[PDB]
Amino acid sequence: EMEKEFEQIDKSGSWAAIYQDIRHEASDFPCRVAKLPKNKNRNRYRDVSPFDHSRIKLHQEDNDYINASLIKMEEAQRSYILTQGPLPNTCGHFWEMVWEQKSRGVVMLNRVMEKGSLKCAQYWPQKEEKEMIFEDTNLKLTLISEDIKSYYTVRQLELENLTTQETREILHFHYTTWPDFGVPESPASFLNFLFKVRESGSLSPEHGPVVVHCSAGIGRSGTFCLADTCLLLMDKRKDPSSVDIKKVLLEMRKFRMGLIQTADQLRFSYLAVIEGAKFIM
Ligand SMILES: [Mg+2]
């Protein structure tokens, strides 16, 4: 079991070493589309590049590229799209992807400002009465409502295809308390946030994949998906104890790089899966 394993690593002080084995085992696929000169302005510096095979394609004729990847977890029956925090010039693209992929939810695991530096564009409206128009992709976006809680905020947004006048309700799940340095001391609030995203229907099969992002190059998104999938598999399988977080991570890692960026994030993932499992089971 996983708690046993966790403890073997904790007292043995081998987090760094176990983390490094996984990293060497991990997949390495081409990212040629991402490295094309015409796409240089579509990529966030110090951020991951999407593998070609799993990249999400915008449905426009001009340039179909966005830094986003589809993680498809076959056994768990979950899909997630992981993407970079929108850039000043890719907000239209971002919401285009949300529209076309039929996503219900967007999961944001960073603040707009962290460490005194901008981590993404203000890509959603902060006020009901001041909507946003993305002229490049023909979308309007409106803040419908906003509910600020201690560890996270949930917003309802409406997206309008300006040409056809169709509308879609999107839920924005904004985790606002991940510390600037390290990981949360207790996974409790993060698990609670995951349960709120679940409760919304945003991870469920009736919708397209949730869109998940964080800040550039420092993970978090992978932890959210890893924890979600592991907990789901523990409920599905005849043998819950066969769920190996390393194996689930390695499978996820086939679809996008930089899922777990440090030994501490790995430790935190174990910790979230264990306490999440105790709470559900
Ligand atoms: Mg394929």
Annotated binding residue 220: yes
Instruction: Read off the tokens for 257.
Output: 């790089």
Q: Which of 201, 263, 273 is nearest to 13 (CA)?
A: 263
Q: Which of 277, 270, 239, 261 is nearest to 75 (CA)?
A: 239
Instruction: Read off the tokens for 217.
Output: 């190059």
Please give the angle made by the CA atoms of 178, 247 and 254, to the nearest 5 degrees. Answer: 80
Instruction: Read off the tokens for 220.
Output: 């978090």
- Name 161's Cβ contacts closer than 8 Å, sequence gap at least 6: 99, 138, 139, 167
Contact 134, 161 (CB under 8 A): no
Please give the angle made by the CA atoms of 189, 191 and 196, to the nearest 5 degrees. Answer: 95
Ligand 1 ion: Cβ-proximal residues, 5 Å cutoff: 53
Annotated binding residue 217: yes
- Name 135's Cβ contacts closer than 8 Å, sequence gap at least 6: 92
CA 110 to ligand 1 center in whole angstroms:
30
Query: What CATH number labels 1-281?
Result: 3.90.190.10
CA 55 to ligand 1 center in whole angstroms:
10
What count of residues does the chain have? 281
Instruction: Read off the tokens for 25.
Output: 């085992």
Long-range contacts of 129-134, Cβ-Cβ distance < 8 Å, separation of 24 or more: 132/91, 133/162, 134/91, 134/92, 134/95, 134/96
Reported as type and span, the H/E element at residue 223 is helix 221-236
Q: Give 132's strand partners.
A: 141
Annotated binding residue 214: yes
Annotated binding residue 218: yes
CA 71 to ligand 1 center in whole angstroms:
11
Helix (H, G, I), strand (E, B), or coil: what is residue 106? Answer: strand
Interatomic CA distance for residues 4 and 12, integer angstroms: 12
Residue 168 burial (CB count, 10 A): 15
Q: Give 158's strand partners.
A: 142, 169
Could you give the residue numbers annotated as active site? Answer: 214
Interatomic CA distance for residues 239 and 156, integer angstroms: 38
Residue 247 burial (CB count, 10 A): 13
CA 53 to ligand 1 center in whole angstroms:
5
Instruction: Read off the tokens for 90.
Output: 């890719």
Annotated binding residue 68: no
Interatomic CA distance for residues 262 and 281, integer angstroms: 28
| 3-class SS string, 124-159 | CCCCCCCCEEECCCCEEEEEEEEEECCCEEEEEEEE
CA 10 to ligand 1 center in whole angstroms:
38
- CA distance to 32, 97, 123, 256, per residue, from 162 (Å): 33, 15, 18, 32
Instruction: Indicate the DSSP class of residue 256.
Output: -
Q: What is the largest CA-CA distance in the chain?
A: 60
Residue 245, burial from CB neighbour count under 10 angstroms (0-12, 13-18, 19+): buried
Interatomic CA distance for residues 220 and 110, integer angstroms: 9
CA 1 to ligand 1 center in whole angstroms:
33
- CA distance to 56, 69, 269, per residue, from 222 (Å): 17, 12, 9
Annotated binding residue 104: no
Instruction: Indicate the DSSP class of residue 61.
Output: S
CA 54 to ligand 1 center in whole angstroms:
7
Interatomic CA distance for residues 147 and 154, integer angstroms: 5
Rg (CA), the chain: 18
List the resolution, Å.
Answer: 2.2
- CA distance to 58, 75, 181, 207, per residue, from 108 (Å): 20, 25, 17, 18
Residue 84, burial from CB neighbour count under 10 angstroms (0-12, 13-18, 19+): buried
Annotated binding residue 261: yes
